[PDB]
Amino acid sequence: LSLRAASASLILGNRVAERELEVAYSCDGVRAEVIPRMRRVDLYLKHDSQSYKLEVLFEDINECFGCHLDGTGAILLQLTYAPRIHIAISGSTAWVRALDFTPNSSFGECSTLVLKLSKGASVSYILESLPFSGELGELAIASMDVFGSSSNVVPLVDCPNGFSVPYEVLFRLNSLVHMGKLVARHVNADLFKVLEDLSIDTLRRIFEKMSKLKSTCYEPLQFIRHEAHSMNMRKKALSNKRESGKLMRCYRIHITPSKIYCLGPEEEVSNYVVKYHSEYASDFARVTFVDEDWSKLSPNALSARTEQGFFSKPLKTGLYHRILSILKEGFCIGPKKYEFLAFSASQLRGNSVWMFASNSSLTAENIRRWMGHFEDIRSVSKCAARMGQLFSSSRQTFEVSSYDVEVIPDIEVTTDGTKYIFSDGIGKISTRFARQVAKLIGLDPAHPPSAFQIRYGGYKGVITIDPTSFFNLSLRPSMKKFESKSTMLNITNWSKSQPCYVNREIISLLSTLGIKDEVFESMQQDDMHESDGMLTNKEAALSVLGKIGGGDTKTAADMLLQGYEPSSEPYLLMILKAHRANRLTDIRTRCKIHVQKGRVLIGCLDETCKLEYGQVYIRITKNHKEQKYSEQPFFCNDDGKTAVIVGKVAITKNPCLHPGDVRVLEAVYDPGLDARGLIDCVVFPQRGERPHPNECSGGDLDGDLFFITWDDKLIPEKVDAPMDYTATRPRIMDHAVTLEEIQKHFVSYMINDTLGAISTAHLIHADRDPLKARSPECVQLAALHSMAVDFAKTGAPAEMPLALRPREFPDFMERWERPMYVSNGVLGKLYRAALRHAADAAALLPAGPPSCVYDPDLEVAGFDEFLDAAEERYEAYAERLGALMTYYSAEREDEILTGNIRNKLVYLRRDNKRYFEMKDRIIAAVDALHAEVRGWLRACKEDDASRVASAWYHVTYHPDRRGEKRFWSFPWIICDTLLAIKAARRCRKRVEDAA
């Protein structure tokens, strides 16, 4: 009872106007079925020689319509995303993943579909299971005549020869055509004329405005001309549109297996090359090969091994060859054609690639040759990884002269014919140079981070401070992965006292050792109670906030410390509710529960050779939650702000899949090692028969991250033996550095890598078995995982034997598309506890009237002016943040302020890594925005900052002047200097107001 079939024709096309339906393709016999059980509409198709399938979901259709035609009733499906296209090769009645079939490549151009009826029969008109949205006009039109090819990349649009527009506006018009807000063939010469008449910022703003509508703009001339008339009169001009050269705009480009998809040039942190070739920044393209609806391209979309043709040789379905060709040759976009450049490790996991538009004064080969001397490497995967090494998002400091850097003999050791490099990925650095670096990357010069994960020249390691003078930093003969002429040292990131979080993997790996689940339940319960109390208590909110990074949390912390409360401020209310909801959902779906006794720190290595093997050194900074109870049995020294762990402490690093990747080690307190200023480094042994980090899952100090905890209930008693890594010794052939080899290995990684699959299968077999880490399944999957993550150095095939891939799935993943089953392990029990807590405690409606009142205290009596001089600035900030909100598909100021969206998109519900990447991008964009706003503030007179901030507050809160706006968070954006006058309001400013 899950079928509503029909047999009708098909009309792929666009809408010239509201009711002018243009067609560019025709095919009959299309079998239209609908199944709501998976939210899908399917179109079986029969093209000239074979069969095809057009699947679509409901989370991508925009509207639907009815009769509105001459012959029969149709349905106009406007699609935000193209429909998935499959073919059949096997021989059964096994699908496939292949690209389109149209002769003139019309499957990407026309973004609308017309599923007509079968009026001769009109079999059960299926408006059923389709969310109807508005009716329409009348019959269809004709005269589609593009017939272009455009380097097999479609759809695009180019400026006719009689014009000259900047590349940004052309890219933006193309992206608008892609999203469906602009009509394809409505961009004539007159449109280009009226656009070239304007400026660039005006075009930008008008595109941000029109990019909001849920439907196409059939009269673009009208819209552009009217808004150009309007924008010219709110005010003429503005002030300081921008002043500082922050993070740069990337032109992201998705390449679906059927069509291209531009994305507006968005603020983003740049790697070394992009910022180096500064004025060519409008040519680099971080093109990411994605699946149909921007979800990551599944490895089953490049090969399938169809069951009707079950065998080896996974046959590399046509999408493989499409990606290969489009990466080899390239594609044209208006004036410039893009040729492949490179890809980094992060981009390799993220299914990305950097491409460049070769031209006169620069070319991709020139780029790769300016990078370094990769002419001798006789191995493909090492070559790929080394070439990508210089493509990591970094905050470049100045350059390092060739005399300052100097190699120091790396610490090697041999154990019974087995080599072991101790310090592979870490070098010294002076305190003075470290302070300088910390100054130029926005940190505390008085408290330089003890180490920095960096990639400099042909080295990729971690520079760790040391108080011995007479040098600049260091080198090491184990860091040089290739030779190059670069001088500028980059900064991937630095070390920080990040609060530890036990993910599902770590929880499983600790439960398998013997740590009873009761402590896990206790910690989860403590966190739920604390988060729930955060809505109405000062200390509770401070506590739940302290474990969340971001400037918004610092502002809210200062606000709470200064004596405010949710009932008083609505901005604090919104931010607190958003953070609380995010934390609750996160603890539910990911088990990312806080652990008050622990941390996550980057690796480190001892230099004094003083501490013995089997014991590490740790020294962290006490946080706000531990400024109350500073008398604990696991602290050795104490300087008020920092402390030293002494108890038997466990340490591992994620992904941790084998029992033994965790190690329970003692902790000591060397007066010399403490005098050496090191802090929040997990100082490891320089001696012993084996390096301790190598006893972890993969193991090294190449900027990894160890979760390390000293809770007496989490430490295991006995521990399995550490593993041995020696697995690969790779060298094959081809004796050359041809770029085609790079492309082939890249697509090979794409087709073979199954990292997430291995991790989740490890978790599944861990929970579904009594040993929980020591099953043959678990150890085999651990070895295979260590071989698959061994891709970025060896390139071995990451085969995943289907004898382990789970057709089933337990409950604690919340995925509602696969066979479920209730769990009994500790992860499933913790998730059930969290879910019952949510359902059981979901009682907030009995709170009260959370309506706010404009605090009659926070103001300055001399502020009657500056109302008109600040309302315009607030409108500017509001429209900018609204553009940012509509771009990232946010709906209210909270989800974009926090950096997490509520009405999730289809390509983030499934993915987690790319979702964290998008979260980081949002956080960086919002940080840039707040920096710009703080600059606006520092643009006014220093003796006027309090007055103008109070004017901001009074014009955004007092309901006499704020009834239509929807953004409260403006003034508190400078709270660090606003609520300070609060102290002036309460330091003998009245009769007895505070004294």
CSV table of N, CA and C in Angstrom, one decimal, residues 264-339:
chain,number,residue,atom,x,y,z
A,264,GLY,N,28.7,31.9,-3.9
A,264,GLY,CA,29.2,33.3,-3.7
A,264,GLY,C,30.5,33.4,-3.0
A,265,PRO,N,31.4,34.3,-3.4
A,265,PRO,CA,32.7,34.4,-2.8
A,265,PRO,C,32.6,34.8,-1.3
A,266,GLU,N,32.8,33.9,-0.5
A,266,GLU,CA,32.5,34.0,1.0
A,266,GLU,C,33.8,34.2,1.7
A,267,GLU,N,33.7,34.9,2.8
A,267,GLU,CA,34.8,35.1,3.7
A,267,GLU,C,35.3,33.8,4.3
A,268,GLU,N,36.6,33.6,4.3
A,268,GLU,CA,37.2,32.3,4.7
A,268,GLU,C,38.7,32.6,4.9
A,269,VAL,N,39.3,31.7,5.8
A,269,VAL,CA,40.7,31.8,6.1
A,269,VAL,C,41.4,31.1,5.0
A,270,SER,N,42.6,31.7,4.6
A,270,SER,CA,43.3,31.2,3.4
A,270,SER,C,44.5,30.4,3.8
A,271,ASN,N,44.9,29.5,2.9
A,271,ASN,CA,46.2,28.8,3.1
A,271,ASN,C,47.3,29.7,2.6
A,272,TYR,N,48.5,29.1,2.4
A,272,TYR,CA,49.7,30.0,2.1
A,272,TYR,C,49.6,30.5,0.6
A,273,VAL,N,49.4,29.6,-0.3
A,273,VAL,CA,49.5,29.9,-1.7
A,273,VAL,C,48.5,31.0,-2.1
A,274,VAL,N,47.2,30.9,-1.7
A,274,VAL,CA,46.2,31.8,-2.1
A,274,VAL,C,46.5,33.2,-1.7
A,275,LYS,N,46.9,33.4,-0.4
A,275,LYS,CA,47.3,34.7,0.1
A,275,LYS,C,48.6,35.1,-0.5
A,276,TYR,N,49.5,34.2,-0.9
A,276,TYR,CA,50.8,34.6,-1.6
A,276,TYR,C,50.5,35.3,-2.9
A,277,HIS,N,49.9,34.5,-3.9
A,277,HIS,CA,49.4,35.1,-5.1
A,277,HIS,C,48.2,35.9,-4.8
A,278,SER,N,48.4,37.1,-4.2
A,278,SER,CA,47.3,37.9,-3.7
A,278,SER,C,46.3,38.4,-4.8
A,279,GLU,N,46.8,39.1,-5.7
A,279,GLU,CA,46.0,39.7,-6.7
A,279,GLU,C,45.5,38.7,-7.8
A,280,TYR,N,45.8,37.5,-7.7
A,280,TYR,CA,45.2,36.4,-8.5
A,280,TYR,C,44.2,35.6,-7.6
A,281,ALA,N,43.8,36.1,-6.5
A,281,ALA,CA,42.9,35.4,-5.6
A,281,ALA,C,41.5,35.2,-6.2
A,282,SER,N,41.2,35.9,-7.3
A,282,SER,CA,40.0,35.7,-8.0
A,282,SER,C,40.1,34.6,-9.1
A,283,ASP,N,41.1,33.7,-9.0
A,283,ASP,CA,41.3,32.6,-9.9
A,283,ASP,C,41.4,31.3,-9.2
A,284,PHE,N,41.9,31.2,-8.0
A,284,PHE,CA,41.9,29.9,-7.3
A,284,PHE,C,40.4,29.5,-7.0
A,285,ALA,N,40.2,28.2,-7.1
A,285,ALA,CA,38.8,27.7,-6.9
A,285,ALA,C,39.0,26.4,-6.1
A,286,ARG,N,38.4,26.5,-4.9
A,286,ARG,CA,38.3,25.3,-4.0
A,286,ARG,C,37.1,24.5,-4.4
A,287,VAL,N,37.2,23.8,-5.6
A,287,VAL,CA,36.1,23.1,-6.2
A,287,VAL,C,36.0,21.7,-5.4
A,288,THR,N,34.8,21.4,-5.0
A,288,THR,CA,34.6,20.2,-4.2
A,288,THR,C,33.6,19.3,-4.9
A,289,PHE,N,34.1,18.2,-5.4
A,289,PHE,CA,33.3,17.2,-6.0
A,289,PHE,C,32.3,16.6,-5.0
A,290,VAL,N,31.0,16.9,-5.2
A,290,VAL,CA,30.0,16.4,-4.3
A,290,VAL,C,29.0,15.7,-5.0
A,291,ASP,N,28.1,15.0,-4.3
A,291,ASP,CA,27.0,14.3,-4.9
A,291,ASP,C,25.9,15.3,-5.3
A,292,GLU,N,24.7,14.8,-5.7
A,292,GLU,CA,23.6,15.5,-6.3
A,292,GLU,C,23.3,16.8,-5.4
A,293,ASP,N,22.8,16.5,-4.2
A,293,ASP,CA,22.3,17.6,-3.3
A,293,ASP,C,23.3,18.1,-2.4
A,294,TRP,N,24.6,18.2,-2.7
A,294,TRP,CA,25.7,18.7,-2.0
A,294,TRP,C,26.1,17.8,-0.8
A,295,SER,N,25.4,16.7,-0.6
A,295,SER,CA,25.9,15.7,0.3
A,295,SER,C,27.2,15.1,-0.2
A,296,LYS,N,28.1,14.6,0.6
A,296,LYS,CA,29.3,14.1,0.2
A,296,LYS,C,29.1,12.9,-0.8
A,297,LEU,N,30.0,12.8,-1.8
A,297,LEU,CA,29.9,11.9,-2.9
A,297,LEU,C,30.2,10.5,-2.3
A,298,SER,N,29.2,9.6,-2.3
A,298,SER,CA,29.4,8.3,-1.7
A,298,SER,C,30.4,7.5,-2.5
A,299,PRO,N,31.2,6.6,-1.9
A,299,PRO,CA,32.1,5.7,-2.6
A,299,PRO,C,31.3,4.7,-3.5
A,300,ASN,N,30.0,4.5,-3.2
A,300,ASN,CA,29.2,3.7,-4.1
A,300,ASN,C,28.7,4.4,-5.3
A,301,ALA,N,29.0,5.6,-5.5
A,301,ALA,CA,28.7,6.4,-6.7
A,301,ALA,C,29.8,6.3,-7.7
A,302,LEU,N,31.0,5.8,-7.4
A,302,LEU,CA,32.0,5.7,-8.3
A,302,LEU,C,32.3,4.2,-8.7
A,303,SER,N,31.8,3.3,-7.9
A,303,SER,CA,31.9,1.9,-8.2
A,303,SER,C,30.8,1.1,-7.4
A,304,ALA,N,30.3,0.1,-7.9
A,304,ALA,CA,29.2,-0.6,-7.2
A,304,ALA,C,29.5,-2.1,-7.0
A,305,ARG,N,30.0,-2.8,-8.0
A,305,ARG,CA,30.1,-4.2,-8.0
A,305,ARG,C,28.7,-4.8,-7.9
A,306,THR,N,27.9,-4.5,-8.9
A,306,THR,CA,26.5,-4.9,-8.9
A,306,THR,C,26.3,-6.3,-8.6
A,307,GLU,N,25.3,-6.7,-7.9
A,307,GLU,CA,25.1,-8.0,-7.4
A,307,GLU,C,24.8,-9.0,-8.6
A,308,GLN,N,24.1,-8.5,-9.6
A,308,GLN,CA,23.9,-9.3,-10.8
A,308,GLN,C,25.2,-9.5,-11.5
A,309,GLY,N,26.2,-8.7,-11.3
A,309,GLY,CA,27.5,-8.9,-11.9
A,309,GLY,C,28.6,-8.9,-10.8
A,310,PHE,N,28.3,-9.6,-9.7
A,310,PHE,CA,29.2,-9.6,-8.6
A,310,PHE,C,30.5,-10.2,-8.9
A,311,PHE,N,31.6,-9.4,-8.9
A,311,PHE,CA,32.9,-9.8,-9.2
A,311,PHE,C,33.9,-8.7,-8.8
A,312,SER,N,35.2,-8.9,-9.1
A,312,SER,CA,36.2,-7.9,-8.9
A,312,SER,C,36.1,-6.8,-10.0
A,313,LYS,N,37.2,-6.0,-10.1
A,313,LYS,CA,37.1,-5.0,-11.1
A,313,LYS,C,35.9,-4.1,-11.0
A,314,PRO,N,35.8,-3.2,-9.9
A,314,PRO,CA,34.6,-2.5,-9.6
A,314,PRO,C,34.1,-1.6,-10.7
A,315,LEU,N,34.7,-1.6,-11.9
A,315,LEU,CA,34.3,-1.1,-13.2
A,315,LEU,C,34.3,0.4,-13.3
A,316,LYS,N,34.4,1.1,-12.2
A,316,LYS,CA,34.6,2.6,-12.2
A,316,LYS,C,33.5,3.2,-13.1
A,317,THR,N,32.3,3.2,-12.5
A,317,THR,CA,31.1,3.8,-13.2
A,317,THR,C,31.4,5.2,-13.7
A,318,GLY,N,30.6,5.5,-14.8
A,318,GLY,CA,30.9,6.7,-15.6
A,318,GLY,C,31.2,7.9,-14.8
A,319,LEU,N,30.7,8.0,-13.6
A,319,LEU,CA,31.0,9.2,-12.8
A,319,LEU,C,32.5,9.3,-12.5
A,320,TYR,N,33.1,8.1,-12.4
A,320,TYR,CA,34.6,8.1,-12.2
A,320,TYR,C,35.3,8.8,-13.4
A,321,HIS,N,34.9,8.4,-14.6
A,321,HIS,CA,35.5,9.0,-15.8
A,321,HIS,C,35.1,10.4,-16.0
A,322,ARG,N,33.9,10.8,-15.6
A,322,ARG,CA,33.5,12.2,-15.7
A,322,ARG,C,34.4,13.1,-14.8
A,323,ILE,N,34.6,12.6,-13.5
A,323,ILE,CA,35.5,13.4,-12.6
A,323,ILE,C,36.9,13.4,-13.1
A,324,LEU,N,37.4,12.3,-13.7
A,324,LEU,CA,38.7,12.2,-14.2
A,324,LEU,C,38.9,13.2,-15.3
A,325,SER,N,38.0,13.2,-16.3
A,325,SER,CA,38.1,14.1,-17.4
A,325,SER,C,38.0,15.6,-17.0
A,326,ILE,N,37.1,15.9,-16.1
A,326,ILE,CA,36.9,17.3,-15.7
A,326,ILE,C,38.0,17.8,-14.8
A,327,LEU,N,38.8,16.8,-14.2
A,327,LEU,CA,40.0,17.2,-13.5
A,327,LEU,C,41.2,17.4,-14.4
A,328,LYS,N,41.3,16.5,-15.4
A,328,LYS,CA,42.4,16.6,-16.3
A,328,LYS,C,42.3,17.8,-17.2
A,329,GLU,N,41.3,17.9,-18.0
A,329,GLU,CA,41.2,19.0,-19.0
A,329,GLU,C,40.8,20.3,-18.3
A,330,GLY,N,39.7,20.4,-17.6
A,330,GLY,CA,39.3,21.6,-17.0
A,330,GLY,C,37.9,22.0,-17.4
A,331,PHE,N,37.5,23.3,-17.1
A,331,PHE,CA,36.2,23.8,-17.5
A,331,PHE,C,36.3,25.3,-17.6
A,332,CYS,N,35.5,25.9,-18.5
A,332,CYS,CA,35.4,27.3,-18.7
A,332,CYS,C,34.4,27.9,-17.8
A,333,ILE,N,34.7,29.1,-17.3
A,333,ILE,CA,33.7,29.9,-16.6
A,333,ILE,C,33.9,31.3,-17.1
A,334,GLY,N,33.1,31.8,-18.0
A,334,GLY,CA,33.2,33.1,-18.6
A,334,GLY,C,34.5,33.3,-19.2
A,335,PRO,N,35.3,34.3,-18.7
A,335,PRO,CA,36.5,34.6,-19.4
A,335,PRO,C,37.6,33.6,-19.1
A,336,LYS,N,37.7,33.0,-18.0
A,336,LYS,CA,38.8,32.2,-17.5
A,336,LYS,C,38.4,30.7,-17.5
A,337,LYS,N,39.4,29.9,-17.9
A,337,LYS,CA,39.2,28.4,-17.8
A,337,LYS,C,40.1,27.9,-16.7
A,338,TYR,N,39.6,27.0,-15.9
A,338,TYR,CA,40.3,26.5,-14.8
A,338,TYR,C,41.0,25.2,-15.1
A,339,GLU,N,42.3,25.1,-14.6
A,339,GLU,CA,43.0,23.8,-14.7
A,339,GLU,C,43.4,23.4,-13.3
